[PDB]
Structure 1
Amino acid sequence: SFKAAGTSGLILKRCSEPERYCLARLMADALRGCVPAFHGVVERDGESYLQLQDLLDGFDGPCVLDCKMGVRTYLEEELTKARERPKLRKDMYKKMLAVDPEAPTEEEHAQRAVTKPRYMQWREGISSSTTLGFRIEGIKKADGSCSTDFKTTRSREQVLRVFEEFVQGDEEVLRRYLNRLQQIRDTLEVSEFFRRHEVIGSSLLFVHDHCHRAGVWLIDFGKTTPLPDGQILDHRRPWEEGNREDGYLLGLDNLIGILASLAER
């Protein structure tokens, strides 16, 4: 999905129409500073790429944690599609049997395949997504080491322990992360973009280094979609099919609470 840009400090991501639309709006929004700078689109090898700020550029050997935000992680239109015209996914079946052999139904076992929405719902439930409104997806280091081994990280305390290990006792990093999340929450709550879009499948990317530099940005607007006609979301109330609620701010509230708790340990 990513390639190296010519210009210093930039990075290319394969263009997608929803994401291009979102980033454009966001540069003119209150949230402008809370997302990677978007510099337009460019062609390479006959294909479109977003020109983005490389969020790692200011850092010396950055540690990175990606947190998928929301209680729901698929669009409502996927549910519609899975009813009328299910696309059976065999890979998604095998993961289930790995985490939980009793998870698939008798019929799923017989099909060796599940619908995407079914797969995404189960993933939300064995992780923290359903209960806390976010989940940890991965950690990268310049230590070189990366991990995506977080599929059953669910309890508030399991999540805390992952962040505890990620910050490695750096009080300044943690204080900065918290300060940045508070300011992001404040921006989200007045953002014109945020009240009028359903924000699904995006992440908060935490970045720090051994010099105590810390930043956090919202990324990945590929599944972020406008609400029709001045309908708005509050981003905290439970999702019920039809209301298009994403629980984004429930997740952000909970994440801030966990980091604040960690800070007081």
Structure 2
Amino acid sequence: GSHMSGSFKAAGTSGLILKRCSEPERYCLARLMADALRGCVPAFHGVVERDGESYLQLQDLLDGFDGPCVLDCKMGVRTYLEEELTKARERPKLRKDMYKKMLAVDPEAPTEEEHAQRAVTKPRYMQWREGISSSTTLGFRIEGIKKADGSCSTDFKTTRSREQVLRVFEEFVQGDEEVLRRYLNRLQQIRDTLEVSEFFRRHEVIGSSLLFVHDHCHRAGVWLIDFGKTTPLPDGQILDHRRPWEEGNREDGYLLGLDNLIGILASLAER
């Protein structure tokens, strides 16, 4: 029905939502409304001011649905900008929170020096996260589910193997063959759109998600969201979005992820 049902605020207009304006994200949504990918992203209506702050006026993707189930998939083999690697080398901001969150999952993960600092760099933390999830090997990872019964979970930090990922989607679709077939049709059409998109070939797409939304009426949709770390390549250079990331090549592995995601849902459909 609606997401509002901490970047988000309720909109005055029916079927809209407000998201805290960020300059990279605003730039991307404006380009996307004129791109092949227009229909694959939430409608962007422009910027509005609320309590002296800038917000993006977005389509509420949950509006068409009756008690929506939602799954957030973060796309890419890499989940941080290359500029974070430079910053961490020349001017590291040691993160005590990231050390604790790492220690919690694997007490042998931090180095002797990280234990001594009780702190890690952001890129180090995000690289570790990529490796214990499916990000590094499959090019995406499950971040969170919201179920129609009001329940939610973010407990996927060690969801890594092809079969572990399949079991999460299997539980998500709860044997609804119509929802799964509609998800697969939508991902096939999104892949086709990404492969021809002028935007996609000229941008590094980091930290974006695919949002899966379905209901008990068998309505199913998928959209790309979260363009806060999507940036254009300099002087008309392009990415293939499949080849491995090597510092300087700005590759995101986005389509490696989408290929693997389509493969898993196609496998689930035949179970």
Point out where structure 1 has 5 or more consecutive residues left out of the alignment. Answer: none
Q: CA deviation at 1:254?
A: 0.1
Matched, 1:76 2:73: no
Matched, 1:50 2:59: no
Q: CA deviation at 1:160?
A: 0.1
Matched, 1:39 2:53: no
State the alpha-carbon separation in 2 of the partners of residues 116 and 176 from structure 1. 37
Query: What is the aligned residue count?
Result: 265
Partner of 2:3: none
Partner of 1:178: 184
State the alpha-carbon separation in 1 of the partners of residues 219 and 148 from structure 2. 14
Partner of 1:228: 234
Q: Deviations over 1:112-134 (max 9, x none)?
A: 00000000000000000000000
Q: 1:45 aligns to what SS in structure 2?
A: coil
Q: Deviations over 1:14-50 (max 9, x none)?
A: 0000000000000000000000000000000000000
State the alpha-carbon separation in 2 of the partners of residues 37 and 97 from structure 1. 40
Q: TM-score, normalised by structure 2?
A: 0.98
Partner of 2:247: 241
State the alpha-carbon separation in 2 of the partners of residues 24 and 231 from structure 1. 21
Matched, 1:217 2:223: yes
Moved more, 139-148 or 125-134: 139-148
Q: 1:210 aligns to what SS in structure 2?
A: coil
Partner of 1:116: 122
Q: 2:93 aligns to what SS in structure 1?
A: coil
- 2:16·2:58 contact (CA, 8 Å) conserved in 1? yes
State the alpha-carbon separation in 1 of the partners of residues 147 and 199 from structure 2. 32
Matched, 1:160 2:158: no
Q: Deviations over 1:85-141 (max 9, x none)?
A: 000100100011111000000000000000000000000000000000000000002
- RMSD (Å), alpha carbons: 0.3
- 2:148·2:215 contact (CA, 8 Å) conserved in 1? no
State the alpha-carbon separation in 1 of the partners of residues 147 and 268 from structure 2. 21
- 2:43·2:58 contact (CA, 8 Å) conserved in 1? yes
State the alpha-carbon separation in 2 of the partners of residues 205 and 42 from structure 1. 24
State the alpha-carbon separation in 1 of the partners of residues 84 and 34 from structure 2. 30
Q: Deviations over 1:43-90 (max 9, x none)?
A: 000000000000000000000000000000000000000000000100
State the alpha-carbon separation in 1 of the partners of residues 149 and 18 from structure 2. 24
State the alpha-carbon separation in 2 of the partners of residues 147 and 102 from structure 1. 26
State the alpha-carbon separation in 2 of the partners of residues 89 and 226 from structure 1. 28
Q: CA deviation at 1:142?
A: 2.8
Q: 2:213 aligns to what SS in structure 1?
A: strand
Q: 1:88 aligns to what SS in structure 2?
A: coil
Q: TM-score, normalised by structure 1?
A: 1.00
- 2:183·2:222 contact (CA, 8 Å) conserved in 1? yes
State the alpha-carbon separation in 2 of the partners of residues 57 and 201 from structure 1. 24
State the alpha-carbon separation in 2 of the partners of residues 88 and 144 from structure 1. 37
- 2:177·2:269 contact (CA, 8 Å) conserved in 1? yes
